[model samples]
Target: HHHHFNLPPGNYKKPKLLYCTTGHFLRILPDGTVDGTRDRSDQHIQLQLSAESVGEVYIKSTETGQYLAMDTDGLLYGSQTPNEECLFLERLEENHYNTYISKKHAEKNWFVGLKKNGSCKRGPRTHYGQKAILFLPLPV
Candidate 1:
């Protein structure tokens, strides 16, 4: 028997607008900080999705002019330049939302998680655990 893997089509031409499970839209603050807010129109995160490799992409924040990045201490932040820590493995979850895992730390399953206050944190991969790790595309 033979098996093949296929990937869903992505909108590379247009940026992605994402909202967290916490009912807040992800935003890049003027100070280059990443957070979530209830404000939809202005706070809607404009993620410049670039194909990094098969099933993976690099996310850049158009608001702050930075890239969604993770540090050595597992803290999520915005980086001015794209780095290894900025690449994320975009996986389509069973529930239909997309989960982003740190490409550089795939063995550790470190994922971008959102706190109750809309702050970003790194956590182990959990299936359908929270909205922070699972990002849904906001309808344009």
Candidate 2:
């Protein structure tokens, strides 16, 4: 029944700075940490994306050497050894800022969202179409 999903054209190696409209940039630190930041000099935040399937993708910090992951409990973290938890559906919404949700817990409604003050919102408390999770894949 797997007829394949949408595909990402080109290499998609274009480094990305996921600028959240909520006033922060999604960041992965050099210490293998994850969080949101409003300042560019805060830490390592640029990310490189890998296509697992057409609709599925793997997000890794180009500088931190960790993959963005979601555990079974549905929280955001950086994984040194990424499994299925590291896979996400990079949604291309009409708003163009884009959205990221766990492929494993999508039906459960877990999304990568941030607060207005540069903090990540828990997956359980977040929902689809929230501006907190609206990420603009702005390239440098």
Candidate 3:
């Protein structure tokens, strides 16, 4: 069955981005061997989207990297899969920002990260995914 969910209109606010709060440093052991802790950093960068007239905003990352995408709020729109395409929404300003979801194409499952290239050349293609997770920072 085809179900259509409506997303609240997007309002572009002054774009803002948050950074990871904790530093990810590796430790070494004194027993002539290197010992390290596998503590994944929970720190994340958050963008304060404009006020919404309906529900809330959400985000999802690609399957391989730590990239994240702000997407629309819903299951049909933002929900992802291996076959369905993940949407890539542009971040505010001239920086080439986008997001999407990717299933396991290799040893690692999908993980999210920020794109410095603003270019999708190194990762998944733009038109091959579902809608973005949130509409924040609105389309530039």
Candidate 4:
């Protein structure tokens, strides 16, 4: 007799994912000091990983930006591109605050891009949010 291991039940089939992009606007002040929106300029974009899936993924900054696909086994595949400059890796467990500043090179033009490849039982998939956390005591 052969012994068999039972596999945990989950949505083995990959579900569709969505993407969003946001921008920052600068307002010049009289004092020549830019009135920066402290923690207020941050935005939040939600990507529905479909229904019936357990555990949520929190990606920040280059985390999500570095991946095309994340497997349960922690294997990440690179998104094929003409430039091949996109970094690819598995889902990260770090909390990265998306900060946008006029001077910062990346955040100033940062883009949250997601590619969902199918329809859903839950209607259209949407992802939006420029800033990660807002109105919280801390940790934005």
Task: Highest lDDT: give the candidate number.
Answer: 2
lDDT of all the models against the reference?
0.69, 0.77, 0.25, 0.22
The reply for model 1, stretches above 4 Å from the true place, is 1-9, 124-128
Provide the lDDT at 102 for model 2: 85
- Output the better candidate (1/3) by lDDT: 1
Please rank every candidate by lDDT, starting with the best. Answer: 2, 1, 3, 4
TM-score of the candidate numbered 4? Answer: 0.17
Give the clashing pairs for model 4: 19-114, 42-131, 43-130, 43-131, 44-129, 45-128, 45-129
Clashes per model (N, Cα, C within 3 A): 0, 0, 22, 7
**Candidate 3 all-Cα RMSD:** 15.9
lDDT of 4 by residue, 13-86 (tens): 34222211122211112222221222233332111122221222222222223222222222222332212222
lDDT of 1 by residue, 43-68 (tens): 43777778778777788876666888
Best by TM-score: 2
- Per-residue lDDT, model 2, residue 38, is 81
lDDT of 2: 0.77
Model 4 worst lDDT window (10 residues) = 118-127
Pairs clashing within candidate 2? none
The TM-score values for the models, in the order shown, are: 0.82, 0.86, 0.19, 0.17
2 against 4, candidate with superior TM-score? 2
